[PDB]
Design an enzyme around this catalytic site. Structure first.
Site, PDB file in Angstrom:
ATOM      1  N   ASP A  40      44.818  41.106  19.521  1.00  0.00           N
ATOM      2  CA  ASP A  40      44.825  39.966  18.602  1.00  0.00           C
ATOM      3  C   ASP A  40      45.283  40.365  17.196  1.00  0.00           C
ATOM      4  O   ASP A  40      44.912  39.712  16.220  1.00  0.00           O
ATOM      5  CB  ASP A  40      43.418  39.341  18.567  1.00  0.00           C
ATOM      6  CG  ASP A  40      43.402  37.817  18.293  1.00  0.00           C
ATOM      7  OD1 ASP A  40      44.466  37.162  18.164  1.00  0.00           O
ATOM      8  OD2 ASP A  40      42.258  37.266  18.234  1.00  0.00           O
TER       9      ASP A  40
ATOM     10  N   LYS B 104      47.304  40.513  13.886  1.00  0.00           N
ATOM     11  CA  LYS B 104      48.239  39.753  13.061  1.00  0.00           C
ATOM     12  C   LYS B 104      47.612  39.602  11.669  1.00  0.00           C
ATOM     13  O   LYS B 104      46.395  39.746  11.527  1.00  0.00           O
ATOM     14  CB  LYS B 104      48.561  38.375  13.669  1.00  0.00           C
ATOM     15  CG  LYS B 104      47.351  37.538  13.988  1.00  0.00           C
ATOM     16  CD  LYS B 104      47.744  36.208  14.603  1.00  0.00           C
ATOM     17  CE  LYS B 104      46.523  35.458  15.092  1.00  0.00           C
ATOM     18  NZ  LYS B 104      46.845  34.185  15.796  1.00  0.00           N
TER      19      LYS B 104
ATOM     20  N   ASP C 261      37.847  39.522  14.685  1.00  0.00           N
ATOM     21  CA  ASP C 261      37.924  38.715  15.892  1.00  0.00           C
ATOM     22  C   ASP C 261      38.067  39.594  17.133  1.00  0.00           C
ATOM     23  O   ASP C 261      39.001  40.395  17.240  1.00  0.00           O
ATOM     24  CB  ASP C 261      39.099  37.757  15.784  1.00  0.00           C
ATOM     25  CG  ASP C 261      38.789  36.585  14.888  1.00  0.00           C
ATOM     26  OD1 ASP C 261      37.879  36.733  14.034  1.00  0.00           O
ATOM     27  OD2 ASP C 261      39.418  35.515  15.059  1.00  0.00           O
TER      28      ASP C 261
ATOM     29  N   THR D 263      49.531  36.199  20.280  1.00  0.00           N
ATOM     30  CA  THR D 263      50.314  35.314  19.426  1.00  0.00           C
ATOM     31  C   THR D 263      51.798  35.612  19.620  1.00  0.00           C
ATOM     32  O   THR D 263      52.185  36.789  19.647  1.00  0.00           O
ATOM     33  CB  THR D 263      49.881  35.511  17.971  1.00  0.00           C
ATOM     34  OG1 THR D 263      48.503  35.141  17.858  1.00  0.00           O
ATOM     35  CG2 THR D 263      50.676  34.631  17.015  1.00  0.00           C
TER      36      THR D 263
HETATM   37  C1  LIG Z   1      37.005  33.303  12.549  1.00  0.00           C
HETATM   38  C2  LIG Z   1      38.022  32.949  11.478  1.00  0.00           C
HETATM   39  C3  LIG Z   1      39.371  32.816  12.264  1.00  0.00           C
HETATM   40  N1  LIG Z   1      40.604  32.897  11.431  1.00  0.00           N
HETATM   41  C4  LIG Z   1      41.135  34.268  11.166  1.00  0.00           C
HETATM   42  C5  LIG Z   1      40.290  35.037  10.172  1.00  0.00           C
HETATM   43  C6  LIG Z   1      38.857  35.179  10.635  1.00  0.00           C
HETATM   44  N2  LIG Z   1      38.058  33.962  10.393  1.00  0.00           N
HETATM   45  S1  LIG Z   1      37.190  33.869   9.000  1.00  0.00           S
HETATM   46  O1  LIG Z   1      38.060  34.297   7.949  1.00  0.00           O
HETATM   47  O2  LIG Z   1      36.594  32.575   8.947  1.00  0.00           O
HETATM   48  C7  LIG Z   1      35.900  35.053   9.135  1.00  0.00           C
HETATM   49  C8  LIG Z   1      35.581  35.475  10.396  1.00  0.00           C
HETATM   50  C9  LIG Z   1      34.636  36.471  10.583  1.00  0.00           C
HETATM   51  C10 LIG Z   1      34.028  37.061   9.514  1.00  0.00           C
HETATM   52  C11 LIG Z   1      34.334  36.659   8.190  1.00  0.00           C
HETATM   53  C12 LIG Z   1      33.773  37.262   7.041  1.00  0.00           C
HETATM   54  N3  LIG Z   1      34.045  36.894   5.797  1.00  0.00           N
HETATM   55  C13 LIG Z   1      34.896  35.869   5.626  1.00  0.00           C
HETATM   56  C14 LIG Z   1      35.512  35.208   6.644  1.00  0.00           C
HETATM   57  C15 LIG Z   1      35.264  35.605   7.980  1.00  0.00           C
END
Ligand SMILES: C[C@@H]1C[NH2+]CCCN1S(=O)(=O)c1cccc2cnccc12
Lengths: 353, 20
Positions: free
Chosen positions: A169, A171, A187, A204
């Site tokens: 995963d 990117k 993730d 992706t």
């Molecule tokens: C799950 C989502 C999916 N989109 C990609 C990026 C990862 N996020 S996130 O930025 O909301 C995030 C996930 C996990 C821990 C974090 C810790 N601190 C901030 C954001 C955090």
């Protein structure tokens, strides 16, 4: 030869010490993997502040622990939605991985728990936002800046691969920047613990290795391909293979042709040709010398691998930090209520959570 | 140019994984 006696001895010793570290790291991982932690907090321990991210996965909210005042990032998954999207195994596996791993560039799961409606993973709040945002804003990273991030991914994949975890995963959207400018990987829904090959079509489009596109069995070498894509995108500002639609992207990926901006150094182009190598028998990270073909490449000649691991290198970029709880490095999202039904939902499915 | 081609691709924003 390329190294005199002192440099060869130092490199050999360094490589043997990595083996020793990884052996201990595996022992520790396997203990937590076999006896995972559960139910280490509850919802009313936290004030919910603001949504940091959303998606089909659910949402992540900035929360504040009521006693300590410490902020955390709370991932909230609706058990019924997870079942409907066929993500039970991925969701259980992500939490199991996160509670078992330990590495300076992997986000820490500080608490987890569940209630009648939802699953909750409470992670460290990583306040610098996504690498994606910084990259699109700045345009492209200098080679030293890209290299600093790349080195962290190399070490993180060396660690994960030693545990037989394929990541799948990578990117810029999935890489966060912390207050010291270092990377956090968060993730693990697509990660899989497998020693040999696996077959799932996942990832992706821009970051998929040819063998995934071609419906082959594949192995951890797909992560080293994805590292090549990431380094290219960091240094160019755009990825090596793009097009209007995924099918056209896949044609370019499998073609065996890549072109480089005129500002890429020769060392960078040589590394990328060896990572973005369609022939698995030739791809760096997949040869007899393993990760050492990458770590010892000329493009990384100035990298002090231990200093990166120890977080003693001064980061080239520090995100703006206006204090604990500051969310300015994340986007704004519509805030939605958090419903907790009076009736337990999908209990048997999530016993292990 | 390559940059202009990237802008024209429509894929300059956050990219979803296949399953999404
Ligand atoms: C799950 C989502 C999916 N989109 C990609 C990026 C990862 N996020 S996130 O930025 O909301 C995030 C996930 C996990 C821990 C974090 C810790 N601190 C901030 C954001 C955090």
């Amino acid at each position: 030869g390329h190294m005199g006696n002192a440099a060869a001895a130092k490199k050999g010793s360094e490589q043997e010490s990595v083996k020793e570290f990884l052996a201990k790291a595996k022992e520790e991982f396997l203990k937590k993997w076999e006896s995972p932690s559960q139910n280490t907090a509850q919802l009313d321990h936290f004030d919910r502040i603001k949504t940091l991210g959303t998606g089909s996965f659910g949402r992540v909210m900035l929360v504040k622990h009521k006693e300590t005042g410490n902020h955390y990032a709370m991932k909230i998954l609706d058990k019924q939605k997870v079942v409907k999207l066929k993500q039970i195994e991925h969701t259980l596996n992500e939490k199991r991985i996160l509670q078992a791993v330990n590495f300076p560039f992997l986000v820490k799961l500080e608490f987890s728990f569940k209630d009648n409606s939802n699953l909750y993973m409470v992670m460290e709040y990583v306040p610098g936002g996504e690498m994606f945002s910084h990259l699109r804003r700045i345009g492209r990273f200098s080679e030293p800046h890209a290299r600093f991030y790349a080195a962290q991914i190399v070490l993180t994949f060396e660690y994960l691969h030693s545990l037989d975890l394929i990541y799948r995963d990578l990117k810029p959207e999935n890489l966060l920047i912390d207050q010291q400018g270092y990377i956090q990987v968060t993730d693990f829904g697509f990660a899989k613990r497998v020693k040999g090959r696996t077959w799932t079509l996942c990832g992706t489009p821009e970051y998929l290795a040819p063998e995934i596109i071609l419906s082959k069995g594949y192995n951890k070498a797909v992560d080293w391909w994805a590292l090549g894509v990431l380094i290219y995108e960091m240094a160019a500002g755009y990825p090596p293979f793009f097009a209007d639609q995924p099918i056209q992207i896949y044609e370019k990926i499998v073609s065996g042709k890549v072109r480089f901006p005129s500002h890429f150094s020769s060392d960078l182009k040589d590394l990328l040709r060896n990572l973005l190598q369609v022939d698995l028998t030739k791809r760096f990270g997949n040869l007899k010398n393993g990760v050492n073909d990458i770590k010892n490449h000329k493009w990384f000649a100035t990298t002090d691998w231990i200093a990166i691991y120890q977080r003693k290198v001064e980061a080239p970029f520090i995100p703006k930090f206006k204090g604990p709880g500051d969310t300015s490095n994340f986007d704004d999202y519509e805030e939605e209520e958090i419903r907790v039904s009076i009736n337990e939902k999908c209990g048997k499915e999530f016993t292990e959570f | 140019t390559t940059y202009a081609d990237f802008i024209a691709s429509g894929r300059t924003g956050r990219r979803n994984a296949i399953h999404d």
